[PDB]
Short mmCIF file of C-alpha atoms (C1' of nucleotides) in Angstrom, two decimals:
data_model
loop_
_atom_site.label_atom_id
_atom_site.label_comp_id
_atom_site.label_asym_id
_atom_site.label_seq_id
_atom_site.Cartn_x
_atom_site.Cartn_y
_atom_site.Cartn_z
CA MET W 15 13.40 -14.63 13.93
CA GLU W 16 9.68 -14.68 13.39
CA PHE W 17 6.72 -12.65 12.05
CA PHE W 18 7.78 -9.36 13.37
CA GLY W 19 11.36 -7.90 13.21
CA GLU W 20 12.62 -7.26 16.70
CA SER W 21 12.87 -3.42 16.25
CA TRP W 22 9.19 -3.12 15.46
CA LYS W 23 7.94 -5.75 18.02
CA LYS W 24 9.68 -3.43 20.53
CA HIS W 25 7.65 -0.37 19.30
CA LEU W 26 4.33 -2.10 18.54
CA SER W 27 3.92 -4.89 21.18
CA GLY W 28 1.88 -2.43 23.05
CA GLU W 29 -1.07 -2.80 20.68
CA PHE W 30 -0.89 -6.47 21.24
CA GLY W 31 -2.83 -6.30 24.37
CA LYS W 32 -5.45 -3.79 23.34
CA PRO W 33 -8.91 -5.25 22.57
CA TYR W 34 -9.20 -3.88 19.10
CA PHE W 35 -6.19 -6.06 18.47
CA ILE W 36 -7.36 -9.13 20.20
CA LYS W 37 -10.66 -8.78 18.23
CA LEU W 38 -9.00 -8.34 14.83
CA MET W 39 -6.59 -11.27 15.25
CA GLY W 40 -9.78 -13.17 16.06
CA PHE W 41 -11.74 -11.79 13.15
CA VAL W 42 -9.14 -12.74 10.46
CA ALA W 43 -8.84 -16.30 12.01
CA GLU W 44 -12.54 -16.71 11.24
CA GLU W 45 -11.98 -15.57 7.75
CA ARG W 46 -9.07 -18.21 7.26
CA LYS W 47 -11.38 -20.99 8.39
CA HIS W 48 -13.99 -19.86 5.84
CA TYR W 49 -12.33 -18.20 2.89
CA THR W 50 -8.76 -17.59 1.53
CA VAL W 51 -7.22 -14.64 3.04
CA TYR W 52 -4.33 -12.92 1.62
CA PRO W 53 -1.53 -12.80 2.55
CA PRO W 54 -0.86 -16.17 4.35
CA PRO W 55 -0.27 -15.92 8.12
CA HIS W 56 3.60 -15.66 8.10
CA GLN W 57 3.84 -13.10 5.40
CA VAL W 58 1.32 -10.46 6.94
CA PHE W 59 4.14 -8.60 8.60
CA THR W 60 6.88 -8.82 5.93
CA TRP W 61 7.08 -5.00 6.04
CA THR W 62 8.92 -5.44 9.37
CA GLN W 63 11.56 -8.10 8.28
CA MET W 64 13.40 -5.68 5.78
CA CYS W 65 14.97 -3.03 8.08
CA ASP W 66 15.37 -1.71 11.52
CA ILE W 67 12.45 0.60 12.27
CA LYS W 68 14.89 3.40 12.98
CA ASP W 69 16.43 2.99 9.48
CA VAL W 70 13.17 3.62 7.78
CA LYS W 71 13.30 6.71 5.42
CA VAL W 72 10.31 6.54 2.88
CA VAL W 73 6.87 5.21 3.61
CA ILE W 74 4.85 3.96 0.63
CA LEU W 75 1.30 3.32 1.92
CA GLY W 76 -1.31 1.62 -0.23
CA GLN W 77 -5.00 0.65 0.14
CA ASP W 78 -4.86 -3.10 1.11
CA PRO W 79 -2.90 -6.06 -0.10
CA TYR W 80 -3.31 -7.86 -3.59
CA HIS W 81 -6.29 -10.37 -3.38
CA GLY W 82 -5.45 -12.91 -6.19
CA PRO W 83 -3.60 -16.11 -5.40
CA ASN W 84 0.11 -16.16 -4.69
CA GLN W 85 0.29 -12.37 -4.83
CA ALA W 86 0.29 -10.36 -1.52
CA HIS W 87 3.36 -11.19 0.36
CA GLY W 88 3.35 -8.41 3.11
CA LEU W 89 5.05 -5.69 1.15
CA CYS W 90 2.69 -3.32 -0.38
CA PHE W 91 2.25 -3.65 -4.26
CA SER W 92 5.16 -6.29 -4.12
CA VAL W 93 4.88 -9.65 -5.84
CA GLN W 94 7.27 -12.81 -5.66
CA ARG W 95 8.97 -14.67 -8.40
CA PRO W 96 7.51 -16.28 -10.36
CA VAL W 97 4.40 -14.00 -10.14
CA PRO W 98 4.07 -11.34 -12.59
CA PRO W 99 3.75 -7.64 -11.81
CA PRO W 100 -0.08 -6.87 -11.48
CA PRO W 101 -1.48 -3.77 -13.22
CA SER W 102 -0.72 -1.56 -10.18
CA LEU W 103 2.85 -2.73 -10.31
CA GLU W 104 3.13 -2.59 -14.07
CA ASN W 105 1.81 1.14 -13.79
CA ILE W 106 4.27 1.83 -10.95
CA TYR W 107 7.27 0.92 -13.15
CA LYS W 108 5.77 3.10 -15.88
CA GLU W 109 6.02 6.26 -13.73
CA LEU W 110 9.57 5.06 -12.72
CA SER W 111 10.67 4.68 -16.40
CA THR W 112 9.84 8.31 -17.30
CA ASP W 113 10.36 9.70 -13.60
CA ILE W 114 13.70 8.12 -13.09
CA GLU W 115 16.18 8.04 -15.91
CA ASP W 116 18.36 4.99 -15.60
CA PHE W 117 15.46 2.70 -14.51
CA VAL W 118 14.31 -0.19 -16.76
CA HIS W 119 11.62 -2.76 -16.14
CA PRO W 120 12.96 -5.18 -13.44
CA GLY W 121 11.66 -8.19 -15.11
CA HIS W 122 9.85 -9.29 -11.91
CA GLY W 123 7.66 -7.69 -9.27
CA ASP W 124 9.48 -8.40 -6.04
CA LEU W 125 10.10 -5.10 -4.10
CA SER W 126 12.05 -6.45 -1.20
CA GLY W 127 15.16 -4.61 -2.67
CA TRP W 128 13.50 -1.07 -1.83
CA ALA W 129 12.49 -1.98 1.76
CA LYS W 130 16.17 -3.07 2.53
CA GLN W 131 17.15 0.57 1.84
CA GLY W 132 14.50 2.01 4.12
CA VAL W 133 11.23 1.93 2.24
CA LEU W 134 8.23 0.82 4.31
CA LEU W 135 5.91 -0.79 1.99
CA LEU W 136 2.58 -0.83 3.82
CA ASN W 137 -1.17 -0.73 3.23
CA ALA W 138 -3.75 0.96 5.39
CA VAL W 139 -5.30 -2.53 5.85
CA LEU W 140 -3.20 -5.64 5.84
CA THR W 141 -5.46 -8.58 5.02
CA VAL W 142 -7.98 -9.11 2.17
CA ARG W 143 -10.53 -11.80 1.64
CA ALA W 144 -10.15 -13.34 -1.82
CA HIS W 145 -11.11 -11.34 -4.88
CA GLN W 146 -12.78 -8.62 -2.96
CA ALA W 147 -11.12 -5.23 -2.62
CA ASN W 148 -10.92 -3.51 0.80
CA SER W 149 -12.87 -6.34 2.29
CA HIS W 150 -11.11 -6.27 5.55
CA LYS W 151 -11.32 -2.67 6.01
CA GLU W 152 -12.69 -0.87 9.15
CA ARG W 153 -12.02 -4.13 10.99
CA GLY W 154 -9.13 -2.85 13.28
CA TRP W 155 -6.22 -2.78 10.96
CA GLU W 156 -6.46 0.96 10.29
CA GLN W 157 -5.97 1.52 13.99
CA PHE W 158 -2.97 -0.67 14.25
CA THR W 159 -1.25 0.79 11.25
CA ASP W 160 -1.96 4.24 12.86
CA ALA W 161 0.24 3.16 15.63
CA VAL W 162 2.84 2.43 12.98
CA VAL W 163 2.46 6.05 11.39
CA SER W 164 2.26 7.56 14.87
CA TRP W 165 5.56 5.91 16.02
CA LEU W 166 7.52 7.13 12.94
CA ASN W 167 5.85 10.49 13.15
CA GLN W 168 6.98 10.61 16.84
CA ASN W 169 10.51 9.13 16.80
CA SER W 170 12.00 10.09 13.49
CA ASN W 171 12.54 13.16 11.29
CA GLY W 172 12.63 14.18 7.58
CA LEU W 173 10.52 11.10 6.50
CA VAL W 174 9.05 11.04 3.10
CA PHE W 175 5.53 9.67 3.29
CA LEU W 176 3.94 8.58 -0.06
CA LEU W 177 0.01 8.37 0.25
CA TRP W 178 -1.34 6.27 -2.65
CA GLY W 179 -5.11 6.61 -3.05
CA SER W 180 -8.03 7.97 -1.03
CA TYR W 181 -7.60 5.20 1.57
CA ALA W 182 -3.86 5.58 2.19
CA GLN W 183 -4.35 9.38 2.43
CA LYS W 184 -6.42 9.07 5.48
CA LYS W 185 -3.24 8.77 7.75
CA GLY W 186 -2.42 12.16 6.45
CA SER W 187 -3.91 14.26 9.32
CA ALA W 188 -1.77 12.36 11.87
CA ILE W 189 1.53 13.16 10.23
CA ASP W 190 3.42 16.37 11.20
CA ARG W 191 3.32 18.05 7.77
CA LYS W 192 6.33 20.15 8.81
CA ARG W 193 8.33 17.56 10.43
CA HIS W 194 7.87 15.20 7.63
CA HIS W 195 7.06 15.38 3.90
CA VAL W 196 3.84 14.03 2.68
CA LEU W 197 3.20 13.35 -0.95
CA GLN W 198 -0.34 12.43 -1.77
CA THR W 199 -1.73 10.97 -5.04
CA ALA W 200 -4.07 8.91 -7.14
CA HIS W 201 -3.51 5.11 -6.40
CA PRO W 202 -1.34 3.39 -9.14
CA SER W 203 -4.34 1.13 -10.24
CA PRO W 204 -5.68 1.25 -13.74
CA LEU W 205 -8.96 2.13 -12.08
CA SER W 206 -7.42 5.35 -11.11
CA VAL W 207 -3.84 6.08 -12.21
CA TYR W 208 -4.97 8.88 -14.71
CA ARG W 209 -6.45 10.68 -11.70
CA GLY W 210 -2.76 11.77 -11.08
CA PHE W 211 -0.29 8.87 -10.51
CA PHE W 212 1.11 8.96 -13.84
CA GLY W 213 3.11 12.27 -13.86
CA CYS W 214 3.33 12.36 -10.14
CA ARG W 215 7.19 12.10 -10.17
CA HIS W 216 6.85 10.87 -6.59
CA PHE W 217 10.06 8.78 -6.85
CA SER W 218 12.33 11.73 -7.96
CA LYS W 219 10.84 14.19 -5.44
CA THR W 220 11.61 11.70 -2.78
CA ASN W 221 15.19 11.53 -3.38
CA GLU W 222 15.31 15.30 -3.82
CA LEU W 223 13.86 15.70 -0.28
CA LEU W 224 16.24 12.93 1.03
CA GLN W 225 19.52 14.47 -0.27
CA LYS W 226 18.76 18.10 1.05
CA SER W 227 18.39 16.15 4.34
CA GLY W 228 21.88 14.63 4.23
CA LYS W 229 20.28 11.30 4.14
CA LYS W 230 21.15 8.72 1.25
CA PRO W 231 18.75 8.78 -1.80
CA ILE W 232 16.82 5.62 -2.42
CA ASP W 233 18.22 3.64 -5.28
CA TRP W 234 15.17 2.51 -7.04
CA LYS W 235 16.76 0.20 -9.53
CA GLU W 236 18.17 -1.82 -6.68
CA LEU W 237 15.61 -4.62 -6.91
"C1'" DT C 17 -8.86 -7.28 -22.90
"C1'" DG C 18 -9.71 -6.10 -16.90
"C1'" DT C 19 -8.63 -3.33 -14.24
"C1'" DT C 20 -11.56 -3.95 -8.69
"C1'" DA C 21 -10.40 3.03 -7.43
"C1'" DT C 22 -13.42 7.04 -6.68
"C1'" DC C 23 -17.11 9.94 -6.86
"C1'" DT C 24 -21.64 10.10 -6.22
"C1'" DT C 25 -26.17 8.51 -4.22
"C1'" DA K 6 -23.80 0.96 4.22
"C1'" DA K 7 -23.19 -0.62 -0.02
"C1'" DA K 8 -23.45 -0.19 -4.74
"C1'" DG K 9 -23.87 2.08 -9.71
"C1'" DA K 10 -21.24 4.80 -13.24
"C1'" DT K 11 -17.62 6.14 -14.71
"C1'" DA K 12 -8.10 5.45 -19.65
"C1'" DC K 13 -4.29 2.46 -20.63
"C1'" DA K 14 -2.58 -2.60 -20.81
#
DNA sequence: TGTTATCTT
DNA sequence: AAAGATACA
């Protein structure tokens, strides 16, 4: 065991030598000497430690990670006991309460339970300097995570991709929109959520597309 | 309430 | 580029 799960290391290690990646791993080191970066070094790739890459079924992609203390733990939008759900997570559950029937507020914000079933919880960018949104954008993450969308797009079928916000949506042009199912919408944040997120029914539409495909529906209450 | 997203310059 | 103006807890 270690920061990457083995099944992803296998299909990603090829970025490890490319200069944009030597550079980015250097850049964020400098950030950690001089500010607090979220998440902390060992949590940055938690999105790999949840299931075998070939077991992935849904991809929920966000902007970047949470940037308040003790929040971002590598799984997009997720937060760990004790931490309370942030607005974006509070909101999410709201859509789920009216989109999905049986679903009731989990009482905590830890979303590991989904990523075990095959939901890749990712953000376009994976680090954030404290208290400043998208602060680590255009630094070489987007390209690395593109390897991650590329590989799925290449080596899997009938994946549901859920693209939350203007920034997540940028991966869109790289997905085969026939091979896969791309559901795009306004980012769950209170700064936006009215732009479409509430009413988007992204959770139910996922299962719908998953069952027609012989695959198992994601059990969203399983948190 | 504070959201820190998004559209526009 | 970076920044000002803009519906529910």
